[PDB]
């Protein structure tokens, strides 16, 4: 039975200590400020960050002129720059370890829609993205955790078929017009 060969994986991990106030409050700060739906969204960002940090630490352990260090360091730095996760002049691979989960959270399409105007709020931005209302280059994206790249940050705008940047009105805007007539 082929299709048994399709891979799949886990994206987050629960905390070792269930109830500690300090972590609880620190996590709720982020879940509120960035308008996330639950702790799992924060924990998957942490897990992705821990992956990239283990890679960076391994490459930093080796010695320069090691072609693995060279090749993978250039690739990892390019990946970090491509998503705006790293300022200019920072391509030293020690500034990857300094990178924070707030930086990943800052690149989600929810946060960028809020930060670009268009939203008036962080929760308005989410409900705006999950209602087919926002496009990136030409495509209607409705996943708030899209993680835009720095190149495509310019072309974000409203959809051509949402009332707020497109064409025809919605259910209720038409419904009131018909009952009015």
């Amino acid at each position: 039975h082929v299709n048994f060969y399709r891979n799949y994986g886990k994206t987050f991990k629960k905390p070792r200590r269930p109830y500690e106030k300090e972590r609880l409050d620190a996590e709720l700060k982020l879940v509120g400020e960035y308008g996330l739906r639950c702790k799992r969204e924060l924990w998957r960002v942490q897990y992705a960050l821990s992956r990239i940090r283990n890679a960076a630490r391994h490459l930093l352990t080796l010695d320069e002129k090691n072609p693995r260090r060279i090749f993978e360091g250039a690739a990892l730095l390019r990946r970090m720059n491509r998503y705006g996760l790293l300022a200019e002049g920072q391509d030293k691979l020690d500034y990857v370890l300094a990178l924070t989960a707030e930086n990943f959270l800052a690149r989600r399409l929810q946060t960028l829609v809020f930060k670009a105007g268009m939203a008036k709020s962080i929760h308005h931005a989410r409900v705006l993205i999950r209602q087919r209302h926002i496009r990136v280059g030409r495509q209607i994206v409705n996943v708030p955790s899209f993680m835009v790249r720095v190149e495509s940050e310019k072309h974000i705008d409203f959809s051509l078929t949402s009332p707020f940047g497109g064409g025809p009105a919605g259910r209720v805007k038409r419904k009131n017009q018909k009952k009015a007539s």
Binding site: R135, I140, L160
Partner: protein, 113 residues
């Protein structure tokens, strides 16, 4: 306004036809039916016969206003009858179908003579 835009398109003389990827754009429409695709394609490739044209595997990209799929233009009716599977011709209306029942389809015929 619908447009048609074929890519990865190559004519082969082995099976005497030409293959391509249709990337129809239909802003405002839901999707383009394969019959209308047949007709429109006939008038960019001037086929004299709109039965040698075959289209399949259409997707209708998420967000709408875009559809891709695979297109085959033949050069004969003979070539389309030899080089095309039966169900595809049935879909284009050049053939007819049958069914099955598996007991005695061979089992008791095995055992008489």
């Amino acid at each position: 306004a619908v447009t048609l835009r074929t890519r990865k398109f190559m004519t082969n003389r082995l099976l005497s036809r030409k293959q391509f990827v249709l990337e129809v754009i239909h802003p405002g429409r839901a999707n383009v039916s394969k019959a209308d695709l047949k007709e429109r394609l006939a008038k960019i490739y001037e086929v004299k016969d709109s039965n040698c044209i075959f289209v399949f595997k259409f997707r209708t990209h998420f967000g709408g206003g875009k559809s891709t799929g695979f297109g085959l233009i033949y050069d004969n009716l003979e070539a389309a009858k030899k080089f095309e599977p039966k169900y595809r011709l049935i879909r284009n209306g050049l053939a007819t179908k049958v069914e099955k029942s598996r007991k005695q389809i061979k089992e008791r015929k095995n055992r008489t003579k």
